[PDB]
Amino acid sequence: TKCTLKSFTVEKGIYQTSNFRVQPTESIVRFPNITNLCPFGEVFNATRFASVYAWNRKRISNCVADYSVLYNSASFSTFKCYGVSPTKLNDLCFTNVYA
Amino acid sequence: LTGTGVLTESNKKFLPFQQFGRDIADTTDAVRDPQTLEILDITPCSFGGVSVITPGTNTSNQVAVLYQDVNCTEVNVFQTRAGCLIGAEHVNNSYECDIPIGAGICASYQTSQSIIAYTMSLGAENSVAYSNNSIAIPTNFTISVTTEILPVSMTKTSVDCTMYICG
Amino acid sequence: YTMSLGAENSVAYSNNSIAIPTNFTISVTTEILPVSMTKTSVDCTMYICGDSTECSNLLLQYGSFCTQLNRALTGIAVEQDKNTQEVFAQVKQIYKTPPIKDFGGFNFSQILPDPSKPSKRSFIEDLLFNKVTKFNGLTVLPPLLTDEMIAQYTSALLAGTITSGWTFGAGAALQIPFAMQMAYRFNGIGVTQNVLYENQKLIANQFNSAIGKIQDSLSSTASALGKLQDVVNQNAQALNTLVKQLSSNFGAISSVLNDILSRLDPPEAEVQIDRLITGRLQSLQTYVTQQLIRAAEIRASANLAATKMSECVLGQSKRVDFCGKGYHLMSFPQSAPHGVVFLHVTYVPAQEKNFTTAPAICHDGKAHFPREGVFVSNGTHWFVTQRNFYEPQIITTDNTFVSGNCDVVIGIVNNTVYDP
Amino acid sequence: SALGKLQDVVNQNAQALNTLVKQLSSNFGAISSVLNDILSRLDPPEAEVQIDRLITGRLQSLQTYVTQQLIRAAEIRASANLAATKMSECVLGQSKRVDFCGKGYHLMSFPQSAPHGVVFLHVTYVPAQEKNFTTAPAICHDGKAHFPREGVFVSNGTHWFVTQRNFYEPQIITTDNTFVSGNCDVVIGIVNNTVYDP
Ligand SMILES: *[C@@H]1O[C@H](CO)[C@@H](O[C@@H]2O[C@H](CO)[C@@H](O)[C@H](O)[C@H]2NC(C)=O)[C@H](O)[C@H]1NC(C)=O
Ligand SMILES: *[C@@H]1O[C@H](CO)[C@@H](O[C@@H]2O[C@H](CO)[C@@H](O)[C@H](O)[C@H]2NC(C)=O)[C@H](O)[C@H]1NC(C)=O
Ligand SMILES: *[C@@H]1O[C@H](CO)[C@@H](O[C@@H]2O[C@H](CO)[C@@H](O)[C@H](O)[C@H]2NC(C)=O)[C@H](O)[C@H]1NC(C)=O
Ligand SMILES: *[C@@H]1O[C@H](CO)[C@@H](O[C@@H]2O[C@H](CO)[C@@H](O)[C@H](O)[C@H]2NC(C)=O)[C@H](O)[C@H]1NC(C)=O
Ligand SMILES: *[C@@H]1O[C@H](CO)[C@@H](O[C@@H]2O[C@H](CO)[C@@H](O)[C@H](O)[C@H]2NC(C)=O)[C@H](O)[C@H]1NC(C)=O
Ligand SMILES: *[C@@H]1O[C@H](CO)[C@@H](O[C@@H]2O[C@H](CO)[C@@H](O)[C@H](O)[C@H]2NC(C)=O)[C@H](O)[C@H]1NC(C)=O
Ligand SMILES: *[C@@H]1O[C@H](CO)[C@@H](O[C@@H]2O[C@H](CO)[C@@H](O)[C@H](O)[C@H]2NC(C)=O)[C@H](O)[C@H]1NC(C)=O
Ligand SMILES: *[C@@H]1O[C@H](CO)[C@@H](O)[C@H](O)[C@H]1NC(C)=O
Ligand SMILES: *[C@@H]1O[C@H](CO)[C@@H](O)[C@H](O)[C@H]1NC(C)=O
Ligand SMILES: *[C@@H]1O[C@H](CO)[C@@H](O)[C@H](O)[C@H]1NC(C)=O
Ligand SMILES: *[C@@H]1O[C@H](CO)[C@@H](O)[C@H](O)[C@H]1NC(C)=O
Ligand SMILES: *[C@@H]1O[C@H](CO)[C@@H](O)[C@H](O)[C@H]1NC(C)=O
Ligand SMILES: *[C@@H]1O[C@H](CO)[C@@H](O)[C@H](O)[C@H]1NC(C)=O
Ligand SMILES: *[C@@H]1O[C@H](CO)[C@@H](O)[C@H](O)[C@H]1NC(C)=O
Ligand SMILES: *[C@@H]1O[C@H](CO)[C@@H](O)[C@H](O)[C@H]1NC(C)=O
Numbered sequence: 001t002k003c004t005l006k007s008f009t010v011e012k013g014i015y016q017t018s019n020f021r022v023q024p025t026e027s028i029v030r031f032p033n034i035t036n037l038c039p040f041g042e043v044f045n046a047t048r049f050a051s052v053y054a055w056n057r058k059r060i061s062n063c064v065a066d067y068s069v070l071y072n073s074a075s076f077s078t079f080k081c082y083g084v085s086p087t088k089l090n091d092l093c094f095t096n097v098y099a
Numbered sequence: 100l101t102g103t104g105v106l107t108e109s110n111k112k113f114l115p116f117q118q119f120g121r122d123i124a125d126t127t128d129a130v131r132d133p134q135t136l137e138i139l140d141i142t143p144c145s146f147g148g149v150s151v152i153t154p155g156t157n158t159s160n161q162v163a164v165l166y167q168d169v170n171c172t173e174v175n176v177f178q179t180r181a182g183c184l185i186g187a188e189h190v191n192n193s194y195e196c197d198i199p200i201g202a203g204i205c206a207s208y209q210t211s212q213s214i215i216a217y218t219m220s221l222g223a224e225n226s227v228a229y230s231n232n233s234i235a236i237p238t239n240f241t242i243s244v245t246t247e248i249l250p251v252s253m254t255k256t257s258v259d260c261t262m263y264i265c266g
Numbered sequence: 267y268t269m270s271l272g273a274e275n276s277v278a279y280s281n282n283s284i285a286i287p288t289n290f291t292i293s294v295t296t297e298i299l300p301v302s303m304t305k306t307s308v309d310c311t312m313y314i315c316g317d318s319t320e321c322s323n324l325l326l327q328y329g330s331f332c333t334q335l336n337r338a339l340t341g342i343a344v345e346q347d348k349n350t351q352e353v354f355a356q357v358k359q360i361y362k363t364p365p366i367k368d369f370g371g372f373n374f375s376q377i378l379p380d381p382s383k384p385s386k387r388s389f390i391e392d393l394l395f396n397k398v399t400k401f402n403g404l405t406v407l408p409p410l411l412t413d414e415m416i417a418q419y420t421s422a423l424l425a426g427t428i429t430s431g432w433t434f435g436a437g438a439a440l441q442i443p444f445a446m447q448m449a450y451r452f453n454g455i456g457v458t459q460n461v462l463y464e465n466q467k468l469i470a471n472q473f474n475s476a477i478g479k480i481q482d483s484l485s486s487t488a489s490a491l492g493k494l495q496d497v498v499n500q501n502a503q504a505l506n507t508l509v510k511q512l513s514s515n516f517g518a519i520s521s522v523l524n525d526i527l528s529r530l531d532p533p534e535a536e537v538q539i540d541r542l543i544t545g546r547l548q549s550l551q552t553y554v555t556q557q558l559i560r561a562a563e564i565r566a567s568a569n570l571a572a573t574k575m576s577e578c579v580l581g582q583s584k585r586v587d588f589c590g591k592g593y594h595l596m597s598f599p600q601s602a603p604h605g606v607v608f609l610h611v612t613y614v615p616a617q618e619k620n621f622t623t624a625p626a627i628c629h630d631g632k633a634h635f636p637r638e639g640v641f642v643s644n645g646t647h648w649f650v651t652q653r654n655f656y657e658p659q660i661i662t663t664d665n666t667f668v669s670g671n672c673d674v675v676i677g678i679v680n681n682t683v684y685d686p
Numbered sequence: 687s688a689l690g691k692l693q694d695v696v697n698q699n700a701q702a703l704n705t706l707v708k709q710l711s712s713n714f715g716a717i718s719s720v721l722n723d724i725l726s727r728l729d730p731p732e733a734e735v736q737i738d739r740l741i742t743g744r745l746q747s748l749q750t751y752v753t754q755q756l757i758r759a760a761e762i763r764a765s766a767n768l769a770a771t772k773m774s775e776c777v778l779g780q781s782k783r784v785d786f787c788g789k790g791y792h793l794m795s796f797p798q799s800a801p802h803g804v805v806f807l808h809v810t811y812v813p814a815q816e817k818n819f820t821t822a823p824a825i826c827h828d829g830k831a832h833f834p835r836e837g838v839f840v841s842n843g844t845h846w847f848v849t850q851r852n853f854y855e856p857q858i859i860t861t862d863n864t865f866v867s868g869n870c871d872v873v874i875g876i877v878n879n880t881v882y883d884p
Contacts, residue, residue, distance in 0.1 A: 018149045167405065237440070239814040249805075459833055460867035
């Protein structure tokens with residue numbers, strides 16, 4: 001109450017000073033149980049690439065995506081993300097991924 | 100999708116293509132467990148305002164705490180319709196309202212002294228001796244003087260908007 | 267179509283004709299006033315930054331914007347109880363009616379508390395309550411005075427008015443027969459008490475019928491309480507708007523704070539959060555401002571209701587149309603959801619005759635004027651009668667006074683004045 | 687506490703100004719709440735952005751202050767109008783309005799000035815002591831029903847008197863105190879007595 005009123009003296013009455021909230025005790029993490037690794041190797045490290053007018057699209061579905069290798073590898077000259085951050089990517093699910 | 104809340108069983112019949120539910124505020128209402136296809140309601144972890152009922156610090160540092168619109172569960176405990184009141188002694192005797200709590204309940208600092216809570220009195224009971232052929236006529240009178248205080252004006256402030264914003 | 271401005275009715279005005287009512291009706295009207303509004307309270311921190319430490323830390327950069335809104339809402343919540351207290355808690359004691367309802371033929375069973383209910387409310391109060399009908403830091407506080415306590419206060423005021431007239435308002439409740447109370451109320455409107463006593467059965471029957479009509483109106487016309495239903499609707503609408511504002515983006519990539527925090531690093535999340543904080547803080551400021559303006563309107567209405575209670579229920583009003591159309595006799599308060607309903611019992615002239623009049627009568631050259639009332643002629647004989655009710659009396663020296671002579675008063679006519 | 691209604695007004699205005707002054711310490715998203723520290727550190731292309739953020743925050747703060755002042759001023763104006771009404775219909779005249787000028791039957795009022803307000807001393811007449819008297823709506827004499835011109839009929843158990851409603855002052859019932867209307871067969875509860883003819 002003293003902090004709420006910014007004073008060391010509190011006048012007689014009833015004051016609303018805070019809000020009671022039962023804090024959580026533990027975290028619950030749920031994900032589909034699957035051990036497949038997403039084939040990021042054969043997309044980046046492929047021998048031959050397609051021309052930009054006929055750019056090749058690959059569909060990634062139903063696999064555990066290990067994005068650590070990507071931002072941890074230093075071969076790449078350009079690495080820029082939009083709409084999401086690389087650090088918060090490893091802990092994030094997607095319906096589909098398109099490469 | 101992350102958040103904090105109590106996960107409970109539900110009777111919400113989600114369609115096979117629906118994975119998440121939302122409330123009016125666009126927050127998550129329920130989820131389908133990705134491992135077992137059941138619908139779980141997400142109820143934000145209970146909460147409510149906290150009010151401190153206290154006599155002035157020039158008298159005593161004892162306080163009572165009112166947890167607004169909650170049950171005396173998740174939190175000398177008195178459950179009222181205003182919330183769960185902890186620290187105030189419940190007294191059967193009524194008195195005039197001092198520090199209002201709500202829902203007819205008021206609190207005060209009284210007797211050795213402590214904070215008490217009670218249902219406030221509305222006034223003394225006084226029946227009128229009514230009958231069809233009896234009239235009461237005053238035989239004496241008193242001249243009384245009362246004080247009525249009214250605001251008329253308020254401080255005539257003026258703010259230099261340019262100097263205030265860009266001094 | 268072009269609306270009509272009521273029916274056209276010319277008055278048969280002339281310089282020597284007066285219309286005096288020969289009959290009257292007792293009417294009961296309903297005046298409904300808002301008294302209080304929902305005591306909302308918003309946790310500005312939980313609303314803006316719910317369960318997010320980063321958002322809260324950004325919110326701290328706006329200083330007192332949060333706590334001054336909590337203060338403004340507290341001020342409103344407090345004045346809502348002040349308004350209720352000022353309207354209903356005007357009696358120092360709790361009065362109760364006698365077990366025998368010997369009120370001269372006046373039936374009050376429909377406005378007095380019904381001891382058989384779980385809450386001692388009147389029948390009409392029950393009718394009124396049956397017509398008027400989250401987790402984001404938005405709460406509603408209960409009123410300080412519960413519905414039962416309001417019903418008890420209206421019961422005390424009604425029992426006082428019925429058994430002691432206006433004496434309980436000024437001081438102590440002084441018992442008086444109800445018929446005599448009405449006799450005083452009639453004298454207060456310029457109608458001699460003998461009219462009440464001679465027609466007591468008719469007046470009581472008209473009163474009972476008017477009350478039955480009030481019950482039928484409240485029981486059948488839902489719109490009768492619109493002034494109070496709109497208040498409930500306005501507060502519900504305000505809260506729904508505030509809640510809907512949480513779904514807005516305000517320029518952010520997403521309205522959901524957790525979806526921003528789980529996707530962007532601090533250097534970008536802080537910008538998106540600042541955008542949401544600005545939007546939600548502006549939304550709260552708009553809500554609070556609307557609540558302050560509406561609260562000021564409600565306060566003005568509550569002050570009007572308190573004025574009517576004091577000068578209408580506890581006393582007798584000489585103010586025209588302050589307490590309903592007609593000559594005010596008495597009023598009865600009733601509680602209602604977030605408001606008060608007054609049943610105003612008034613005297614309205616009902617039937618009239620065309621009489622010839624004169625400002626004065628000559629007798630021996632003296633000009634005689636009425637002490638009270640006016641002179642009337644039915645075409646052959648002159649009488650003096652009270653202005654608001656035809657009751658012809660012989661013109662005598664105890665009804666009139668002499669001032670001046672026949673050569674001064676314009677329109678004076680010749681007659682005789684009986685000397686008892 | 688007797689003057690709380692006026693002390694609160696001073697406090698409310700002081701609080702509004704103190705809030706406004708405290709608002710100068712907020713960053714509103716800027717690197718610093720102090721404008722000179724922004725100007726002394728950033729070039730115009732960045733200083734203008736930080737300044738726009740501070741201007742937006744401080745302008746919103748002023749708008750909030752002004753809105754609160756307009757609402758409070760409207761409340762004060764309504765109170766002042768009520769005070770003027772009481773002054774005119776209470777001090778300058780005599781109020782017939784029940785409880786408009788204090789509890790009781792209003793006699794007179796006296797104005798007093800006060801800081802940012804007015805205090806009225808209302809002098810009222812309040813009945814103090816009462817006795818239980820028997821009453822009747824009318825008295826029969828020769829078959830005529832006599833009603834009081836002013837006051838009511840009372841009986842102490844043996845004799846009937848007429849007295850003013852608000853103060854016990856028994857007088858002999860005479861033809862100069864009552865009037866005749868109708869007869870004994872109409873008024874419910876009429877009692878027998880005698881009417882003195884002076
Ligand atoms: C009306 O009441 C007043 C007081 O309320 C009476 O005045 C008192 O009378 C007694 C005599 O019995 C004195 O001893 C007191 O000193 C008086 N008080 C004051 C303030 O003067 C007054 O006598 C009563 N009148 C009647 C007719 O009984
Ligand atoms: C005054 O008006 C009332 C009704 O407005 C009259 O009461 C009615 O009188 C008729 C007889 O003419 C009865 O048949 C009705 O039943 C009465 N109604 C009620 C409710 O009692 C009353 O008679 C009129 N008086 C005068 C003198 O005209
Ligand atoms: C006052 O009016 C009520 C109804 O408006 C009367 O109550 C009725 O009494 C009759 C018996 O004569 C019953 O048959 C009805 O069912 C009652 N109705 C209700 C709603 O209670 C009451 O008796 C009247 N009081 C007087 C003294 O006449
Ligand atoms: C005007 O009123 C007077 C007084 O009532 C009427 O005079 C009476 O008329 C009746 C006839 O119905 C006679 O029986 C009475 O003897 C008359 N009394 C007196 C003192 O004259 C008079 O007729 C009325 N005139 C009109 C036009 O209504
Ligand atoms: C009322 O009576 C008076 C007298 O009692 C009338 O006065 C007469 O007026 C005429 C016209 O001027 C004179 O010739 C008479 O001499 C007057 N009478 C007397 C006794 O001097 C008066 O006109 C009468 N008015 C009406 C309307 O009848
Ligand atoms: C009612 O008041 C009358 C009027 O004073 C009382 O009659 C008087 O009583 C006294 C006794 O104290 C006698 O001395 C008077 O002569 C009586 N006067 C008359 C005109 O009767 C009467 O006694 C009172 N009764 C009660 C019950 O108080
Ligand atoms: C008041 O006095 C009158 C007489 O002046 C009483 O009238 C009598 O009533 C009885 C019963 O009906 C008759 O038998 C008598 O003949 C009536 N007297 C006369 C002279 O006609 C009347 O009852 C009295 N009322 C009260 C309440 O005492
Ligand atoms: C890519 O594949 C070739 C096989 O031709 C292998 O030698 C090389 O090490 C691979 N690089 C990475 C980064 O996996
Ligand atoms: C505190 O209470 C004492 C009485 O014990 C009084 O003298 C003193 O002035 C009070 N102080 C304040 C700030 O009210
Ligand atoms: C609190 O919970 C108990 C059961 O645990 C229940 O009986 C009681 O009515 C509840 N009170 C409120 C105010 O919800
Ligand atoms: C108050 O009275 C009730 C009976 O109505 C009783 O059950 C209760 O124990 C009493 N409590 C106290 C503190 O006296
Ligand atoms: C009084 O006279 C006017 C003259 O126009 C007439 O219309 C009216 O009906 C008359 N009143 C009665 C009661 O006859
Ligand atoms: C009323 O007016 C008419 C004509 O306007 C006039 O002849 C008559 O004398 C007037 N009556 C009175 C009492 O003035
Ligand atoms: C009048 O009689 C009633 C009977 O209940 C009594 O209570 C009351 O005190 C009496 N009046 C006075 C002034 O004593
Ligand atoms: C007053 O009521 C009693 C019983 O309630 C009755 O006996 C008496 O006659 C009534 N008096 C009048 C004047 O109606």
